[PDB]
Every structure is written in C-alpha cells, then in structure tokens.
Nucleic acid binder design. Sequence first.
RNA 1: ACGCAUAAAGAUGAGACGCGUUUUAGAGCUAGAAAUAGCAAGUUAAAAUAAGGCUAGUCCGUUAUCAACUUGAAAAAGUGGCACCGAGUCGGUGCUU
DNA 2: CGTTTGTACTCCAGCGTCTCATCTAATTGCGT
DNA 3: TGGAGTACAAACG
Length: 1092
Amino acid sequence: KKYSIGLDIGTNSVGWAVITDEYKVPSKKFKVLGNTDRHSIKKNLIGALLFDSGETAEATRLKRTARRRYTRRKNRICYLQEIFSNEMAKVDDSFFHRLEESFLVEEDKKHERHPIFGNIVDEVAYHEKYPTIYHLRKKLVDSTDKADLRLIYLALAHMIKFRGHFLIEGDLNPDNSDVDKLFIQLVQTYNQLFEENPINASGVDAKAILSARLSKSRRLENLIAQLPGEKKNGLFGNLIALSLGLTPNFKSNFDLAEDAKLQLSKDTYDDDLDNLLAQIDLFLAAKNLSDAILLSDILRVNTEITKAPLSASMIKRYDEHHQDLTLLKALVRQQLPEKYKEIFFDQSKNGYAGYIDGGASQEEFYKFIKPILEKMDGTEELLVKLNREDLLRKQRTFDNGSIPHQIHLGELHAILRRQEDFYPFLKDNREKIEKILTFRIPYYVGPLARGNSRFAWMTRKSEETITPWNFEEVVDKGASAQSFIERMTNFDKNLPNEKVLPKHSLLYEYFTVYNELTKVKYAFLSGEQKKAIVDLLFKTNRKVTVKQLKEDYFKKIEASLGTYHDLLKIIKDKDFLDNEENEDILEDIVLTLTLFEDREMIEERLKTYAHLFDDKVMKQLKRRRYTGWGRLSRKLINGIRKTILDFLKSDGFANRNFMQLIHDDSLTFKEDIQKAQDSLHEHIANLAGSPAIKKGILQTVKVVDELVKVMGRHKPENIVIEMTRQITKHVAQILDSRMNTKYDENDKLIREVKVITLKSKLVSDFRKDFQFYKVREINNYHHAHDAYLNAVVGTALIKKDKGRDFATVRKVLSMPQVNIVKKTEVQTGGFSKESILPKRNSDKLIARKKDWDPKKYGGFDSPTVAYSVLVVAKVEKGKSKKLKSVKELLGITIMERSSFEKNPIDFLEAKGYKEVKKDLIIKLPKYSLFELENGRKRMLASAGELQKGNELALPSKYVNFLYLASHYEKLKGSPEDNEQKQLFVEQHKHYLDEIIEQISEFSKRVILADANLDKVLSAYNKHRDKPIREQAENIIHLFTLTNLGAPAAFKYFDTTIDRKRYTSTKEVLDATLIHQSITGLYETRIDLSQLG
RNA sequence: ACGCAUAAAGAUGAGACGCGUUUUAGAGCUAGAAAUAGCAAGUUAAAAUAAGGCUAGUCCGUUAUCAACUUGAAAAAGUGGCACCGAGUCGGUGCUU
DNA sequence: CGTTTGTACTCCAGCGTCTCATCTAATTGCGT
DNA sequence: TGGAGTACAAACG
C-alpha cells in the first residue's frame, strides 16, 4: 500500500506522522515481550519525540585555557626557586617547605607554624615594620644596604607571580607622569615647525583632557573647543594619531611625511615613521603625551621623589584610609552612640565591619554609609571623597587591571642592581630572572606538545625539552608559523586533498584574464591577437577598461592584472618579472606576502633572495602585504594533462571557458571522476548554524529509517520536511541521497522517493481558515498534530475533497492516543557545585583533595548523579546485626562511574551491601518510565525525586472555546467575524465549570495534590463573579498543575500557589518498568515485583 | 547611477590580565567564679582552583555520541503477521502464523 | 518511651576586560 | 530553571 511520512523538525521536538493515500492513519497490533503476562498492544501511527537541547563548546575552552595558565604559573615559581636553591640552603634549608605546609591545619604541619621566620617575635616584628608588601618593595628599591635573602625572594616572587598586562609595547619612561602639562609644549613645537604661527590658545588646561572620559566625542569636542586650529595638524585629526589609534590611517597628514600611513603607534612605528624621516618635533611629542596620559592617570605620585611610583601610590592609598577611619570613629561615637555598636561590631550588615570581614563590596558600603555621613555634622570632606569614589579604599582592589608590566620591570631592575654586589649569583643571573618575567609563548606556536595532543601543531628543530632560555633554538618558528594558517584553510572542492591558491597569485591572474578574453568575439579572438592585446593593454595599463581600448586597438590595426603592475612598481626590472624562469621564484614571494603578518617571518623567508635584487627594492617589498585565499588549486588549472591553461592560451575551439572545457572533453572530464572521492557523522560537519539544529537533523534521520523498518521496508512515496535558507536545502539532500540509492540504464540515480519542503504560512492559514486553533499551554499533542497537518497539506499540494475529508481531520485531531516519548540520557558535566563552603560537621561535604578531610577544611557540596542502579542484597540491620534482605535503589555520581564500570561488585560492597546477586543489577538512566496502578506513571529524575508522566486529553470543544477567550481584542482582526464570535462565546458560561471538573477529576486520579486543588477551587469560587476574559486569562495559567515534566509554581488572580515536589521514590520499587524504542512502538516490560 | 567592501550576526582555535572563595600566619586588653560588661584593632601574604591519568609531555580531564536481547573484543549486523467494527491514554471481532 | 519517616517551608548556586587567526551568511553605505 | 540541603512534627514499634 502507498503511504507518506510527514515531519516537523525543531530545537526540542521532532513530530512524526504516517498517512496512507486516504488521509487517515493506520494502526497495527504490536507485540511486547518480557516477564509480564501481556503479549500485545494496539497503537496508532502518530507520535512526538522530545529531547534536551545541545550546547556550544565555548564554556569548555574557557576552562581549558585556564587550566593551561595555572599549569604554567607554577612552573615560573619553580624556576625561580631553582635559581635560589643553591644559596638558600645556607640561610634556611626549609624555607621553600614551610611555604607548602602553610595551608594545612596546625596538627598536620611538620615544621613550625610561622611561614617566614619560624618564630613568634620575628614574625610580629616583620608585620609591625612592613604592614603590607608595598612597604617592602619601596624599601628595597630605595635603599643601599644588604637585604636578607628571604625578603628579596619574597619581593621578587610577588612580581613574577603577578605581572600586569602585556598589551603595551616599547618602553615607558617613568618620569612622563609629571609632564602631562606638555600640551603647551606640543603647540609650541607645532608653532616652531609650522612657522605661520598657529593659534597658541592656552585657556584650557591639559587637566580637562586627562580627567575626562576621553572618548572620541569628548576628545574631539574638548580639543576643538580649546583649539579652533587653523590647520588639521593642531587639532583632533592629528592629535588622534598623537594619542590614539588612527582613524585617518591613510593620509595621516598631507604636508609632511610623504602623505603616507600610520595606524596605531606600534613598535613598527619606529620604521613606519620613515615617511616623515624622508621629507622633514610634531610627531615626537606623541610619545611623551601618551606616556603622560597613561602614567598620570594611573599614578597618584610625582615620581621625581622616587624610582618606584606604584609602591609610592599604594602607601598613600593606605594612609588616607587610616586617617579617615580614625576621624569617622570619633564623629559617629560623638553624635550617634546607638549606631557605633552596629557599624563597627556587626558582620552581617553593609557597614564597615561587614565590609572588611563580610563579603560586602565597595559600592554597597558607600550606598549604606552615605546617609550617616550626610545628616551628621562636619563630614563635608568625607562627602567630597565619597563623591570622588576614593573613600576607605583597599590596596589590592578590583580596578588594578590596567597597570603595564614595564613598571614591574623598572622596579625589579633596581631591586637587582642595589643588591647584586653582596649576593654574586644575582649578578650573573639578572638576564635570566628578567627573562622569566618577560618571556611569553607566541600566539601562533600553540601548545608545546609531543604528539599526544589533539590540538597542537608545533614542529621541532630538535628532540629536546623547552625552557625559557632556549625556546627559539628548539622550536623551528618558520614551520610552526606556516602550519598555523595552513591548518585552518580549506581544501579545493574539486580534488579534496590539495591546498588552494592565494587570490593575488599570478597564475590565477593569467587564468582569469585568459578566461575573460577568450569569450571576446567579432570570429573568436585568435591566439596572436591574444598575445598582442595582453602585451599592449593588460601588461601596461593599471585599469584596462572593459570595452573601449579593445575597440581602439581594433581601429588602430584596421578584469585586471593588478599584481603584475604592483610588482612592476615595486621592482622595476621588467624582464625579471616577465620571465618564466623567474615565475617559480616570484610565486613564492606572492605566497609569503600573504601567509605572514608579523614582519619577522617575512625577513626569515625572503633573505635567501637578497642577492638577486638590490637593497632598496627588497626593503620596499618587505613592507608590502596582501590578503585573501581563492577557489582553485594549481593542479586543477595547470600541470595536469597540454594543460588546461595551455588550452586557454591555445587558438581555435579551445577558447571554451574552463567550466565548459573541463566539462565536455573526456580528456579533461577525467579529473572530476579520477579523484571524486563521507557518512552522516562527518557530512553533518558541513552544515552551518548552531548544534541545536544538527541534533534535530540527526534524530530525524534515525526516526525516518526506523519508521521505514517498521512498515515492511517498502519505500515511502513522499517525505515532507519543515523547520530560501541553505539548511533546509541540505536536509533534502541528506534524505534523498539515502532514499534514492538506485541506478538506471545510464548508471545514474533513479528517483524512487521525492523530498518536498513547505513554509509555515500555508499551515497557519489553514489553521485560521478551518478553526483548528492551537493552544500551547494544555498538552504536548500539538507537535504530532503539526506534523500530521504538514503531511496532509504537502501531499494535497503536490497531488493538485474539502467537503468530505474534514470529518477525518477532526477525528484524527481528536484521537486520545499519541506516542509521546522522552529521550533517556546519561548525564555529563562537572562533578558538583563550585562554591567552596565553609567547614561544617555534616557528612555531605566532598573532599577537595585526597588528604583534606572536609570536617576540618571545608569542601564542595551537592554532587550530581549520572545514573541509578537497582540493587538487591542483604544489609546489617539493628544492634543485633540482622542480615535482612532488602531491595533498594542506589545512585551513581559522575565522579564514580569510572570505578563502577571497572568493578561493580567491589563498589556495591563498599556501599555496604552484602551478598548482592549479580545478574539482578539493572541500569536506570534519567527519565526512566515506571507504570503503577490506574495508569499513574512516574519518571525517574534522580535517586530521590520523581516527575509527572501523564498527558491531559482535553476534548476539542474546550480548547476551541478557550482559544476564543485567551485573546479578546487582539484576536478580532475583523468586525464581521467578531460579531458572530462574540454572539457565540456569550451564550454559554458553564464551560468554566466543565474545565474545573475535568482538572479536578484528572488530578484526583493521577496527580494526588489535593490540597492545591482545594486552594484552586476555593479561589475560583471566590472570583466566580468576574467577566469571562478575566477568568480565561488565569484559567489558561491553571493547567500548569497537570502538565508533564517537573512541577513548578504559578499564580491565580491574587493567590500564589507553590509547587508540590514528589519525593516518595520507595513507592516505585514494585512497579512495571517500561523499556521503549525511540519511536516507542517496540516495547519491553520488566516487572520488578518478580525479583527480590 | 549597480556595484561590493562592508558591518554585524554568529562558529572554531590559540595567547595574556584583574578579582572572588577555602584553611592557616598576623601574641586583643581590663573587671569579674563564670555567663557577661566595657574599651582597643581592621587594608597584607603563602597554598589550591574540578578528584586525578600515563603516553611522563611546560601533555590530557565539563562539547558531540548512548531502549532491550542474540552474535561479534568492538565497530557493526540481526531479531516483533494481516483485515474489519469502535474510542478516555487504546480496545474488541475475524483470518493466518 | 524511642525511632523512622512523612509533609510543608525556606534559601541557593564563580565573573569582568584585552590581542590574533580562519570560515559562513545575510546586510547595507554610498562607493562616484 | 528545578534539584540538592536544612529544619519540623506525626505514624509506628
């Protein structure tokens, strides 16, 4: 018999339906097996799979990189301890050890409690003399006396461990923090160079530039307000180049500097400024201006006093906190004695004592303390500081995120240079320590694997271990840098194994220009004319017009080659460029000038050709750049056999374009078959979009194949799919390739099965036209009905009685039975919640390491179960230790399944069970389905919780009525329909009571939440008087009691009603467990009451 | 002015920064039998950031895939009759296994 | 009297900013 | 979101 399949793909559901030539759905008597006494069930060919949505890989990468950074930060300190290790034995042979025993409780320490000095008086003196680390950093920088080696190490480790951002290149001159006023010096120098004496207006201080939020709008407005400059060089158009990345990247200035580019004042600036060098300070002052605007912004100290600006800022940031605390204590105690014992003694409010010791941030502390400062007398300076957001600040606060590492380098350099003459091993290791601080792995070399990585691409110049001091002697940077881009670039589609040509490659240029000119006709343009036209026009003219100059040449005798011309300007040797014996040299150059960007690999690669052309040409070309990868490889256009490029260069009927030349002639048709070559699990990688659709496609294929398997393996006639978009074009190919695997008398496909695709406008119009209204809040049958209607409308459209069929449509929409299925799944993810709880005496705490007992150290909490196993055994009951037989359900967590699947018997024994019976172990994943009396179903959600399992089969008349009242005004859309709709809905009201009765009966049968039903009924009785719309708007909310899935709270007009949480897992240990196939038609029932 | 480089959505990979938690170290004092009472103080550091693994690397550990049962180490293959009259989570009648 | 267990009721969970590279695919400024 | 954890009072031996 003929039939068709309808489908409806989604992000969380896949409706499937089967219809014969008549639009009704067939039914069959499917067999069941197990230890039950049932043998058959009769089911309808309708269903709807449901599943959990997939997710993106981002959140895993964001932790993988963090794991790498934590694995490297320990190695840096390991190197530094190694350097000190030869001498530290003469001072404190255990210093590095107490620093590791520091974390753990006093009972488990092997050495003394005090980390630094190991005895009480010295530790107290140390904390008395240097209240923070910064008072030590500054002391070491500003001193000429021998420091103790422990202090030097402790200061150095702080900077090597915390080292600031690497985002600024070149040097920073520390004293430029003082010279922020040099705006007048800038305009002065601009006046000296531009002797026309531009405006020297000084009425606006640089302070307004530094203090403001100097966005482009603010920068421009403030700059133009202070200087209506007579030329752009004195205003924003140049000062942006002087203080920010250039928006005028081209034509940065027209008068000086060759009219050439500058971009963002990188380290490359020192050579990009050669345009100014060749034709000339206006451009020198930018350096000091930027240094000033940075340092004077971050540093609150004029550095003329000291070499260590940051240590000098933080001391003042500490002193003001002390001086304000001592004042505020006195004021609060004098004016409000009742608040003193709250603010300064609590640890729960947002007060000061709740800001140090609690978790309170700066923002909420100010929010709390503003009023007490405001209404009290004499606090004006505190109000000023608070409005500036500099009141009671901590040193290591959240906003240190902008300090650059040159400051740390400058401090460390002097720290070494003051002490090296007393401790010789520092003298010959300075270059090593400073290297440890500054060393960084380049972004294109990647992980330093040895072949085991799934990610790495690095290649080695030697088989040796990498350290900071010999990185470039072991990694071969050129090969890694090339592979970095070669890894990601895609392959040629026509022969899927060779790399693609760059867009600017010269062979590609010839190919394109020949393919263009061969189509010129007047009769096709013969070969000698090809040579003449190309040599005259395309090798001389920088933009040959499409039309005119060809006609000019024609009348004289009787789309661009850009890279050729750019090379012609870069190197003037005409016959060096225009020679075949140099084509394979220049092609490498055109590749290098697009494969690299860092201006070091280009030196690395071009250097072999330095003899072949003079210095100036080489230095000019080194700065050139190209970008873009094309479509075709070398093998497809040339080399493979005369080649195709030769045929294009030939004369006669070879003028046929590539796309036709390769296609018609067997001699060149041969390539497309000789290397023509794939399963779904890698074809799916070609699909664009998020994984959320890939999952739906994958499930849809399985559903289709298994439906075909059920139906006696006769192929379906038509398949209708639903989501001008590529994805729905790809899915059609995915289905039809598998379906039509059959070949005709010409060895090509036979269309056994047709694939069709629709758009939702038709089905929505059908809904509105024939009043098959959909309400999304009641039950999950809409997926199946949608799929069925898709199949109906698609088959009707492709075949093309409405006065006869609608009865069948009505009944199949009204059928009570629909094969809803939820996909079982083993859980994957993190072991437990991340928050490290404080120590508690409860035993739920999970140890954070092997030998850190949670009772003393705290730890994680609330782990997650992977799957649950039914176990039957004997357990030791009572003080008399009776080995009572027990049947029990146990949960296996993600952390444990590795051991469990390795050895179930010893794990179940370690749980405490004795004499467990092996073959009675069952695996029960999440969402396993159980059936109990009266059809009361429950799904497992964990070892100790359940979920509902039933669908409410509300009749069609009620959903039809509720549709006409869930929307009243917006639903109208037309007066002639509205009048009769209003006349209809008004003439009966008892349907509200019918809905209440239905919900009450269904809840009494299967939900068993009677208290909430009583509350609902009482509230409905209370509000019976309200108009019909007000009733309906919350009657729609009322079905949240009966819907499938985990229970959740909802609200009724004034009353919130809380969720009921089933927990009685014990009631299930004797229910009929159901195993289902994906479609749900094939079933297996295990009766747990026959076991144990 | 039709044109395409464009911004504005994503997908994937690599390189660095700033915080936040947890446990110790920073000798609280006085009057009282104690409970309690009065006052003083507060800003920093070390160690860990999925338990761990063997391939021993400056490497790997949260994405994707997964009813039963027979065979197969596994991949993988294979295993469940039809017509008719009716509907409250699917029934019944008939034929043939 | 002592124990297990059943219901109703809270309170809760790691986060923000940089640089670089490739791809797809639908969009618009105003190129002239 | 929806699941683990704490604190509370009644049925059963």
